[PDB]
Design a protein around this nucleic acid. Structure first.
Ligand SMILES: OC[C@H]1O[C@@H](O)[C@H](O)[C@@H](O)[C@@H]1O
Ligand SMILES: OC[C@H]1O[C@@H](O)[C@H](O)[C@@H](O)[C@@H]1O
Lengths: 207, 207
DNA sequence: GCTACGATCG
DNA sequence: CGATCGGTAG
DNA sequence: GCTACGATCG
DNA sequence: CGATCGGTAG
């Protein structure tokens, strides 16, 4: 059904105006691939790792993380993460601060302090903001990324994203890099598929 | 001695490169006027009020604040502020959130929870960041503004300031609005007078 | 060969 | 405040 | 006549 | 997440 969702999203975006129709046509079908099968602790750690880093840099770090902490080159279990000292994690490429935060997330998972996937699925984005922000290292941007790339939510507009703001400036022909609320206002017509709208804006550099 | 300080600062900035020399020449003498005579609670409230607002908008609000809470059109005392309900403060132009934060600051002053001016004068900017950030509504930007406009510190670079970032993009000929650390790096040569350098960049729009 | 591009800590 | 992890495009 | 331009809260 | 106080330049 993700296919039907993307088709509906693409049709909606193409109905907004000339610029959206043109962008969707040039970029082609949305190929965004979320991974809801991932447990919350994994999705959260993947989101934290991506903070301030490009996809390529993030992937290189996660790859080393899996090779170091896992036995079957898979994503490390909470236990395996706790059995790895922060210095070893840092050696994988995580900043020292992220190394500490990842340890805390693993421990929270082991102690059942993180909401279950079942609970998270019933929570609105606003409720997720209130709940997950209680985790050290996890705030607005990280929760938006977890919502898009792990949960697969379709109407998330990461208006605070620097890259998206730069792309919105070009796309909307603005005289200056927009503030967060300005991006929120400009992309309102994209509802209820703002995640897909964000994805299309993120593809502009590739063009 | 503030005059000798500004003269020294202007001479230093003019010794960096062509662009700084030219900017200082075009803008003229630095006319920044700090107000260290203001008590910490006043400087902090003035800084909070200025959050996200232009100087003109900020002044209009403070003007109403003084007329409403003071008896002699002067800046309200901590007691006078506490005697004013948050709804009345909101009517002066303060956002509802700022109204609550200003009440908290006034109460902190009455309860001697804010460091004394004497202590603040002995604290480094880093120490002020650690100390004053414990106040609701007061974080990095606000502390930088308090340091510049109230304390009169000369080497404060508010690298996180949106306006300054926009001006730095133009001044340094950057292809994109710079990130905070980029502004920090680009203005390093301005030490030990980065407050004055920031002031000159803030004058670019006037030109 | 060289630069720039989340959220937390004293 | 002023740093932080890194692949890669300009 | 009309738009845009810190830090906190459920 | 998605708002928030307002004078004023474009
Ligand atoms: O990390 C998630 C996303 O963050 C954005 O800032 C980057 O521009 C995207 O390419 C990346 O997929
Ligand atoms: O509020 C203090 C300063 O904040 C900056 O963002 C504005 O551009 C300055 O004009 C103002 O004086």
């Amino acid at each position: 059904s993700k296919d039907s969702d993307y088709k509906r999203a693409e049709k909606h975006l193409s109905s907004i105006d000339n610029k959206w129709s043109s962008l969707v046509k040039k970029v082609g079908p949305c190929t965004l691939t979320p991974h809801p099968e991932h447990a919350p602790y994994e999705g959260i750690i993947r989101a934290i790792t991506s903070q301030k880093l490009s996809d390529a840099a993030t992937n290189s770090i996660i790859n080393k993380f899996c090779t170091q902490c896992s036995d079957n080159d898979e994503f490390p279990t909470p236990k395996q993460i706790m059995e790895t000292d922060v210095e070893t994690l840092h050696e994988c490429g995580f900043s020292k601060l992220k190394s500490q935060e990842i340890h805390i997330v693993a421990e929270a998972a082991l102690n059942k302090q993180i909401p279950s996937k079942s609970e998270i699925e019933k929570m609105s984005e606003e409720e997720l903001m209130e709940s997950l922000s209680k985790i050290k290292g996890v705030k607005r941007w990280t929760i938006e990324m977890y919502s898009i790339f792990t949960l697969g939510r379709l109407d998330i507009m990461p208006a605070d994203d620097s890259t998206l703001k730069n792309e919105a400036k070009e796309f909307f022909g603005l005289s200056s890099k927009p503030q967060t609320e300005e991006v929120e206002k400009l992309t309102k017509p994209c509802k209820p598929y703002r995640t897909i709208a964000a994805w299309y804006l993120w593809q502009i550099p590739k063009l």
